[PDB]
Amino acid sequence: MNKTYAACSKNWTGVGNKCFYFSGYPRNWTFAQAFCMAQEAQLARFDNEEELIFLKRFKGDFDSWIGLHRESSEHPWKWTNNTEYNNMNPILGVGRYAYLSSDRISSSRSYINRMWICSKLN
Amino acid sequence: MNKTYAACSKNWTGVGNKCFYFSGYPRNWTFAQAFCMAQEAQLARFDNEEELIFLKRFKGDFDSWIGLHRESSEHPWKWTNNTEYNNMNPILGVGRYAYLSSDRISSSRSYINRMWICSKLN
Ligand SMILES: [Cl-]
Incomplete structure (x- = not known):
């Protein structure tokens, strides 16, 4: 060996x-985050442009939740692990919950059923 | 593994x-294989369903050459390392060169511009 x-x-x-991990069906942001934690993972975080491009290509035509949330349109974006988003990439819209759509990061209310992505280290 | x-x-x-590796621009099967070879890789092989499902998604809305070829429509499919294809999935058509399209494997002559995917072992 x-x-x-x-x-x-x-x-x-x-x-x-x-x-x-790319989900096989759409649910709300809360359910998605619960799912990821049950897999010893988090709603997906990306730390560089190579991960971000992969996530956008692979989610495809399915608008997909990722693990960024803000308390209001005035508060900083944070990951689900409660660290600050580094703000390298713009997030569109005025919502409190982030999702990937085509090649953009957008935002909306959490109640919308969407595919999601989990990430973990390994 | x-x-x-x-x-x-x-x-x-x-x-x-x-x-x-996803090419991101389209060329003929022959140029595609030479590219993969230059990266110490080959036009995409899959050895199971997980890998195939990944390739069918990784190509996005584009077709993609893969590493299957045959001498004629009456010869068995072979990988670019010339090992035998195990025939677990049907390949449509009568062309000599294989490509992914939507969720199926099709075939055609080589001098058609399509995206490609390379593969290698870790
Ligand atoms: Cl194509």
Whole structure:
């Protein structure tokens, strides 16, 4: 034996040290976040442009929730792990919950049923 | 299975112990294979359904060449490493060169411009 590295779990896809999961049906932002935590994951975070482009391409025609939320249109975007969004990429709209749509990041109320993405480290 | 290295190279995407690259611009099958070869890779192979489902999604709304070829419509499909295709999935048509389109595998002659995906092992 030599030393090897864990592959993403079955049905998860890797970019770098991250593993990502794309849901098979649409629910609200709260349900999506609960789902991700039940998978020892979080609603999806991206930390660079390579991850962000992957997430946008792979979610495709399905508008997809990710793990950014703000208390109001006046408060900073935060990840679900309660760290600040670094604001490298613009989020459109005036909503408190972020989602990917075509090649844009947008925002809306949480109640809308959308596909979602989970991410975890591995 | 387990991976030989911690991650895919930058800009490649991982499913289990394989790493994939989407061309992002279209050319003929022959140019596509030469490109993959120059990256120490090949036109995309899949060795299971998970990998195939990933490729059918990773290509987005574009078709994509893959690494299956045959001498004629009356010869068995082979991978670009010339190992036999295990025939788990049907391939439509009578062309010599395989590509993904929507959720099926089709075939055609080579000098048609299409996107491509490369694959290699991690
Ligand atoms: Cl194409």
